[PDB]
């Protein structure tokens, strides 16, 4: 039997799938700990930039769970992602320990732009800026990639990098009451928010697990971006980003929430 996680229903992704918008023909790169083979996922390819781990398989769990919020398959098992027909690419930039070097994330972003990805999901972040990282964000953006990044989980009133950079779309986390989750970083540069508490998705060992974090909010927006691109295939990364903000539901403070809650129904109208 298949279960629809509350967050998927909260961003109104079934209303888009009822219009025939599933993410088909949109390439989405998940720059994370890898993606493990799973019955409710279809991985099309990828690359690893982690020296001790030449495989794209996930030794952690985090990248698999991210991948499932974006694109868990629409069938009779497991769960359902926002864009269940997106072409999923596993770009391992972080190791089995969740740790990763900035050089690894920056070549992940160069691979994305070199391989014609439409959206790159970075559910990772640092409180410090990096020249290397910002240059990689900018080069993937000028190669048409929409870079979507987590605001961070420290609860502080300023957001992490790369989300703070102008060319990355910054995503915060909400709870089931549409309040800011207490860990969700906010402040200048935050663009939008999405569900990030008690998020059920695909996990290694052909199972399902619940996690909390702005890392779980980010894939809801990466997926909504794939829905808008299949609907509007000529739109650029900036057009898609502004539309998602223009159609988001206001939740209060632009300081806390940016444009508000992503809404895949209103975005594919
Ligand atoms: Ca499924
Ligand atoms: Ca930004």
State the CATH number of the domain containing residue 25.
3.40.50.200
Rounded distance between C-alpha atoms, residue 156 and residue 260, angstroms: 18
Range of the domain at 1: 1-269
* 79 is an annotated ligand-binding site residue: yes
The kind and range of the H/E element at 133 are helix 131-142
The span from the CA of 134 to the CA of 118, in Å, is 18
> Is 32 among the residues known to form the active site?
yes
How far, rounded to the nearest angstrom, does the alpha carbon of residue 130 sit from its chain's CA centroid?
21
According to DSSP, the residues that pair with 47 across neighbouring strands are 91
- The answer to whether 195 touches 173, Cβ cutoff 8 Å, is yes
Method of elucidation:
X-ray
Q: What is the resolution of this structure in A?
A: 1.4
CB 12 within 8 A of CB 228: no
CA of 2, nearest ligand number = 1
As for how many domains the chain has, the answer is: 1
**48 catalytic residue (yes or no):** no
Q: Distance, CA 159 to ligand 2 centroid (Å)?
A: 9
Residue 185 in tokens? 């970083």
Neighbours of 233 (CB within 10 A): 10
Residue 97 is a catalytic residue: no
Catalytic residue among 48, 151, 215, 259: 215
Dihedral of alpha carbons 169, 170, 176, 180, sign: negative
How many angstroms is it from 164 CA to the middle of ligand 2?
Answer: 4
Residue 32, preceding peptide bond in cis (omega within 30° of 0): no
Of all helices (H) and strands (E), which one includes residue 78? none
Please give the distance of CA 141 from its chain centroid, rounded to a whole number.
Answer: 16
Q: Is there a binding annotation on residue 75?
A: yes
């Amino acid at each position: 039997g298949q279960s629809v996680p509350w967050g998927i229903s909260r961003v109104q992704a079934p209303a888009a799938h009822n219009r025939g918008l599933t993410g088909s023909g949109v390439k989405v790169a998940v720059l994370d700990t890898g993606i493990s083979t799973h019955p409710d996922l279809n991985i099309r390819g990828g690359a690893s930039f982690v020296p001790g781990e030449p495989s794209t398989q996930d030794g952690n769990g985090h990248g698999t769970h991210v991948a499932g919020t974006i694109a868990a398959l629409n069938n009779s098992i497991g769960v359902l992602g926002v864009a269940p027909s997106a072409e999923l690419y596993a770009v391992k930039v972080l190791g089995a320990d969740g740790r990763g070097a900035i050089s690894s994330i920056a070549q992940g972003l160069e691979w994305a732009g070199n391989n014609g990805m439409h959206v790159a999901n970075l559910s990772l972040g640092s409180p410090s800026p990096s020249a290397t990282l910002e240059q990689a964000v900018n080069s993937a953006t000028s190669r048409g990639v929409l870079v979507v990044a987590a605001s961070g989980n420290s609860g502080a009133s300023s957001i992490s990098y790369p989300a703070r950079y102008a060319n990355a779309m910054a995503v915060g986390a909400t709870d089931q009451n549409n309040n800011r989750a207490s860990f969700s970083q906010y402040g200048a540069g935050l663009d939008i928010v999405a569900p990030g508490v008690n998020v059920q998705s695909t996990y290694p060992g052909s199972t399902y697990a619940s996690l909390n974090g702005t890392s779980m909010a980010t894939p809801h927006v990466a997926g909504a971006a794939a829905l808008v691109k299949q609907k509007n295939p000529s739109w650029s990364n900036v057009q898609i980003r502004n539309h998602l903000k223009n159609t988001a539901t206001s939740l209060g403070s632009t300081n806390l929430y940016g444009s508000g809650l992503v809404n895949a129904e209103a975005a594919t109208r």
